[PDB]
Amino acid sequence: MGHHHHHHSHSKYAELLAIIEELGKEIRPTYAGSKSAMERLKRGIIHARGLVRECLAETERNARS
Amino acid sequence: MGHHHHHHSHSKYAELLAIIEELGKEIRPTYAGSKSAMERLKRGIIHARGLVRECLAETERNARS
């Protein structure tokens, strides 16, 4: 419990969270046949994957894989 | 052509990738008005969001600001 998001600092993670919390909102209008919402949904989904691949290229070498 | 992934390292980022790319598909049946699809999309998004908070809070202890 705590309706108080952290501010978007210079971080893959702060942005990655900010994207995915947005994408959950745009499900309702996308399902309701709204073409602007499905665009925002897709836009963030690809943008999020971009941060995940930045984080993977880093953390996979930093792990042992 | 970047469909080939790496062997998923024991990490939430690897699982996170697998979710978010699949959400890219989930846009199509959700927008179509499939009630099963909006539930898959949302389930994936709240799961993904949880993974990001786990690694964000951990990087909050690691990195300063």
Swiss-Prot record, chains A, B:
Top-level lineage group: Eukaryota
Location in or out of the cell: Nucleus; Chromosome
What family does the entry list? Belongs to the CDK2AP family.
According to the record's subunit comment, the protein's assembly and interactions are:
Homodimer. Component of the nucleosome remodeling and deacetylase (NuRD) repressor complex, composed of core proteins MTA1, MTA2, MTA3, RBBP4, RBBP7, HDAC1, HDAC2, MBD2, MBD3, and peripherally associated proteins CDK2AP1, CDK2AP2, GATAD2A, GATAD2B, CHD3, CHD4 and CHD5. The exact stoichiometry of the NuRD complex is unknown, and some subunits such as MBD2 and MBD3, GATAD2A and GATAD2B, and CHD3, CHD4 and CHD5 define mutually exclusive NuRD complexes. Interacts with monomeric unphosphorylated CDK2. Interacts with CDK2AP2. Interacts with GATAD2A. Interacts with HDAC1. Interacts with HDAC2.
Q: What does this protein do?
A: Inhibitor of cyclin-dependent kinase CDK2. Also acts as a component of the histone deacetylase NuRD complex which participates in the remodeling of chromatin.
Protein's recorded name: Cyclin-dependent kinase 2-associated protein 1
What is the scientific name of the source organism?
Answer: Homo sapiens (Human)
What range of the intact protein is shown?
Answer: 61 to 115 of 115
